[PDB]
Design a protein around this ligand. Structure first.
Ligand SMILES: O=C(c1ccc(NS(=O)(=O)c2cccc3cccnc23)cc1)N1CCN(CC2CC2)CC1
Ligand SMILES: O=P(O)(O)OC[C@H]1O[C@](O)(COP(=O)(O)O)[C@@H](O)[C@@H]1O
Ligand SMILES: O=P(O)(O)OC[C@H]1O[C@](O)(COP(=O)(O)O)[C@@H](O)[C@@H]1O
Ligand SMILES: O=P(O)(O)OC[C@H]1O[C@](O)(COP(=O)(O)O)[C@@H](O)[C@@H]1O
Ligand SMILES: [Mg+2]
Ligand SMILES: [Mg+2]
Ligand SMILES: [Mg+2]
Lengths: 511, 517, 514
């Protein structure tokens, strides 16, 4: 038997693990979405076509660098590559565009010149506007005046990707001692571990970039350095009434964010575990604790969570990943991540397509290895009772799919919500979501197991005929894509009237 | 909060028990069907109307006694009482009729003194069990004749022989050509033609008696809904019952009564070929040690729960109420624990057939069952039935498990299902939803027969089909809604799950819908 | 094959039930203690010897009726029967004596054995006029509780004589409550009255109760079943009446009415244990609800690690018949499965025609039911519900129960002075018998309240070296278990002892082969 089915009906998690079989081949479609970061290695139209075919679902624009015109041509190239497949609607794969904000930052001043900060020496952190350019071996200027007031005596300041460490010995600027020394250049990043950083939820650059995103029709914003619900409120307000339909994924990057996670998740559409900056702000050996916690809570809430950063790092230069990297991707999927991410592996590396292919393969294997027995039971016990017919129908459809080992659940959705409520219970069966909304077809990639199909045909005269035509579009797209076959059982989820919010019908159909 | 919902949301079985509340009042309709035995105390049309109103769901005809004409008048009176309520279709309660077979028997002989004569079997004395036809009418204090010759090859030295409902006990001292020389372990007064039980013995009786063949044909001829097959030891016994019912009685449900050691040990084989099971604790407690009966009961109900087939707990549940208006604490406990064990139906025998408080007995079983149904620990029960039920490609069963899951998700007041044969309602009942399973059907026999499944409330729809089939489906769903509203089980604002099919005819159930009332 | 072990290794409760086997024979000794009510049918020394051999562990004296001299005679006869077996120390069975208090009551008036019939469907006047005190008849009942006329509305029910007679109030007036007989019957003089759903205010201890508790202390009873406990103050009154000399007496609070059920937690907190007194309870609350109350209280008692008693009408038909009904066997078995530490017989042993047979039947059923316990889920839930502890006795106890489960130990042998180490073992419900060796005669009797504790009274003076005396007591437990059939050569046993003499220092678990 395939799909790790021999291990699926185990009575314990230990027995489940013991029964996993490297000869049990994955048969279902890949459910964990792949976010690929755009850069020189992944900007050309032909390369992006290759990456779409490889399995890329979300194109990420890192607004930490690059002009507005650079990102506009990035969007143009991505959209050209995506729409080259629009001529075959039954095979067209929607691809989302995500804007990753530069975010609030603390930077040192200008001293290609560099100076050495020696361990055991005294170094003054100053915010005097006069020191913008006068950096020294014992003097560091920062563009964050209120730094003087948020890092106590005994507090630490991290400079240049955590390579340099300073400990405040005396306050009043902040007189520090070099704990970990090194060579410092100009305008390097500063992190304040354990501190309440008092920067606004959005920088001015962030405001301009978000207006750019709205004007260019991006689907998702990965909001950097989110520490509280008010940061998400600021992002949402800057997006304005024009960007209300855009999904906001809050990036948790520092201690405050992790500790205030509940209030952040409550006001966000989803979460990104930004392990890079997190491993600068908190001890590296603790990052996994953060990851599994956040993923766990996101799974409970039914909201997407993205595991990010250095998943396949070695593939920046070599054609095959390390054993730790394959393990990390598989374990992110097993933790419960809806999406996995590649950064330098696709933006600048020498094997972007190969890295996408690797994440696809690992994710498929790991999704097949999920212990649906206990996972479903715990999601059932923790999700609160609900009188909303969409959620009632969703849990009934997932239960039915598990009962008959359905090849898929085909759901009609306008906004994506019905597919997301199906996915929150983590069915083994693919959730094929037929929609006329192009933006929803792109945004549902954030939810594990949702396979978007964009319907283009004009509405039929009789709504019931239109519903059935969309259902058959789901069937024929699944058949052509090889995931659906004659004789299979499927679960079909629809609603009793037109418009979003009225899903209330579950059907069992044979092909 | 009501319906024992605080105990329903418990994380462990112990906490569930700790959270039960005598002030939490039950809200769902009573789901465990009540079988009442018809007799002198419960034969008049008016009495039967009272018993229907009190909650009787199945009228049981005990063919151990009574002529064909007696049982025909019993059937006519039950049907008159049932149909007196037909004038209000939204409140009409179907009532099933079950034929309980006499079954194969072993009987003693007629005593020498004559029909109205008695002889004393003295504890500690020698008694010859003989099958010589010359002693047929030669019964005395030291010799008992039986109409079952092979007794001499099924009771070895050390075996027990029970006479008159277990009142007399014998242990075989030696075996020989004259018969079994035994000594009286339990003595007593013996009459003529008394019943014999052979505990632990492999009995060779046919599985269906000749009078049984005839009585089953009376059943088919009078349209009985269910047969309680007595003394089933074999798949072959129930197969013989099935053959005797013939092609004309193919729609009649066969409930096999397990009454001795063989049946309990052979249980799976009987269950495989039967529509359901009766735990016949009366004869069982003579055939096996009384202190073991509960084991058999919990085993059998369990397996029936596993198989999705009805199981009936039977006999002496409210025994003291044959003479008293209130039951003993053990009796109420027994009814409640029969519900908790997982029984679909409970039974009354002497309590309704001959007792002085038949209607009150029905009312007490109703009250207790309602409390106990509220006390079910649905979390673990549903999870275990899910884990034990095999995967299925039958759309009716897939729809059933999805509908029950949904009903649990929204605390649905009911699951409304359209069914022709009852099968869709039974597949819902097998997963034991807290929500009532309201089954709308045009089949009067199916409306009667679905009472065997816990939680199925049958409604007989009578209006001819609408011109458009979908309009007819919607009209039957609305009929279910209005019946539930009038009967107090549904109110405005409730959620219900609606289970339908994609085309007319039995076997095409595949649709579940979430609707607000 | 046996002790229902095939069902013991089940993965679900449903599968556990499916795996039960009537051919799987119980092998362990009977762990649920049996309380027998003493009466005319069970007062002679010879009869009591029969009942001890049948399995009686606790003798209950019902002080609702009978003089002090009568109960003294009961005590003397029970003790004579018990000590007649002391000549074989390896087989001697301790037996506890429990005093069941009369409790506060509401009673009808005096009509000696004159009787009147209250006919169903007739009119009956319930009066509290002191002029009608002695004028009871077929249409008039006087009651010694004046406020009855103010707490029973129209439609309210009044039960008379252990619930045998039922009246429903039709009209209320200055003369009293005009009622209709709902359930009729024969009424004697001064019969008990119950007011279901009424808020009745009665003293927590009567004067007769104080004297009866003094009698109990003076005669060395081990347990008091305190009747009609509704709040912690009632058990405090019982404890105070027992006085400084009766500090060692165990208080089992009888829950018999609505208030007791609602205030259960506070009562259990101050009590040694609980009796689900289903007789009065089933009159005080609706009959169809008693099982809820029962399963709740037993559950909480199991949660608390305190003994709980299931009582009344368990084998009622055996008052007149030599065999019980199927419901009665079911009731005993399900009381054991619910988690009761003790089961009880009342009229079945006090006045019925088959007292020894009732004891034997409860013994057989209890053995069968104990084998059918689903220890996997039961142990896991008790472990997760029991608090973490730094007390070495409780730590050792849970370790020893885990060990016994791991090797299917035939017994856990424990040395105990007060019974506490045995009780902490019992709280985790081992399949293995907890064999408790003690020098305390009173503790040997009292530990019968704890399921699975088999008390052995050690009589030999201490050995010179304390470790030798410990080893000798352990070997005494072993040899008693061998002679009584609970232990065989090749069995494994868990042995629980302490590092120094005196109660409270249990801290050692050892694995031994027989
Ligand atoms: O009180 C009960 C009891 C009995 C039946 C009952 N029924 S139930 O519907 O709630 C139910 C739930 C969980 C699994 C089940 C499996 C098959 C049937 N019914 C089940 C719920 C509770 N006990 C069962 C036997 N113990 C004994 C053993 C643990 C020590 C405890 C008592
Ligand atoms: O998941 P959403 O956004 O609530 O969309 C579900 C909706 O889709 C439908 O199935 C189809 O609606 P449309 O015809 O408007 O596309 C509705 O019946 C249902 O309410
Ligand atoms: O429970 P059963 O006997 O399979 O009946 C279920 C059937 O009832 C229906 O809902 C109604 O069918 P009818 O119109 O033929 O009565 C069918 O769609 C479905 O197949
Ligand atoms: O259960 P209890 O009352 O604490 O008794 C346990 C005690 O029994 C013993 O095993 C034996 O003590 P003694 O020698 O004083 O009887 C002690 O080591 C232990 O503290
Ligand atoms: Mg950052
Ligand atoms: Mg029979
Ligand atoms: Mg009492």
């Amino acid at each position: 038997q395939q799909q790790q089915l021999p291990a699926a009906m185990a009575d314990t998690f230990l027995e489940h693990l013991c029964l996993l079989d490297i000869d049990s081949e994955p048969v279902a479609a890949r459910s964990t979405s792949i976010i690929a970061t755009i850069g020189p290695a992944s900007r050309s139209v032909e390369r992006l076509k290759e990456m779409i075919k490889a399995g890329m679902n979300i194109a990420r624009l890192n607004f930490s660098h690059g002009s507005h015109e650079y990102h506009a041509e990035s969007i143009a190239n991505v959209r050209e590559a995506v729409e080259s497949f629009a001529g075959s609607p039954l095979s067209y794969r929607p691809v989302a565009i995500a804007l990753d904000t530069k975010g609030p930052e603390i930077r040192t001043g200008i001293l290609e010149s560099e100076v050495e900060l020696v361990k055991g020496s005294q170094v003054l952190v100053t915010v005097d506007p006069a020191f913008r350019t006068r950096g020294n071996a014992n003097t560091v200027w920062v563009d964050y005046p209120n730094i003087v007031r948020v890092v106590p005596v005994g507090g630490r300041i991290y400079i240049d990707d955590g390579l340099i460490s300073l400990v405040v010995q005396k306050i009043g600027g902040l007189v520090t001692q070099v704990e970990n020394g090194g060579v410092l250049g100009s305008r390097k990043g500063v992190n304040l571990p354990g501190a309440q950083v008092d920067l606004p939820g959005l920088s001015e650059q962030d405001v301009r970039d978000l207006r750019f995103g709205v004007e260019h029709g991006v689907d998702i914003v990965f909001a950097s350095f989110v520490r509280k619900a008010s940061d998400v409120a600021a992002v949402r307000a800057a997006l304005g009434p024009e960007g209300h339909g855009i999904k906001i994924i809050s990036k948790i990057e520092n201690h405050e964010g992790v500790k205030r996670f509940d209030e952040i998740l409550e006001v966000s559409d989803g979460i990104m575990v930004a392990r890079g900056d997190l491993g600068i702000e908190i001890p590296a050996e603790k990052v996994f604790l953060a990851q599994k916690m956040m993923i766990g809570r996101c799974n409970l809430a039914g909201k997407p969570v993205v595991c990010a950063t250095q998943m396949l790092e070695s593939m920046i230069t070599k054609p095959r990943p390390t054993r730790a990297e394959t393990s990390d991707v598989a374990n992110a999927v097993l933790d419960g991540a809806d999406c996995i991410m590649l950064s330098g592996e696709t933006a600048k590396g020498n094997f972007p397509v190969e890295a996408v292919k690797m994440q696809h393969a690992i994710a498929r294997e790991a999704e097949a290895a999920v212990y649906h027995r206990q996972l479903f039971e715990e999601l059932r016990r923790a999700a609160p009772l609900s009188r909303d017919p969409t959620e009632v129908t969703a849990i009934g459809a997932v239960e039915a799919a598990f009962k008959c080992c359905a090849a898929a659940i085909i759901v009609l959705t306008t906004t994506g919500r019905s597919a997301q409520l199906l996915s929150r219970y983590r069915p083994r069966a693919a959730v094929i979501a037929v929609t006329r909304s192009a933006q929803a077809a792109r945004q549902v990639h954030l939810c594990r197991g949702v396979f978007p199909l964009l319907y283009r045909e004009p509405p039929e005269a009789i709504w019931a005929d239109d519903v059935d035509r969309r259902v058959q579009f789901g069937i024929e797209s699944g058949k052509l894509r090889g995931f659906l076959r004659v004789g299979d059982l499927v679960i079909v989820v629809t609603g009793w009237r037109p418009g979003s919010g009225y899903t209330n019908i579950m059907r069992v159909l044979s092909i």
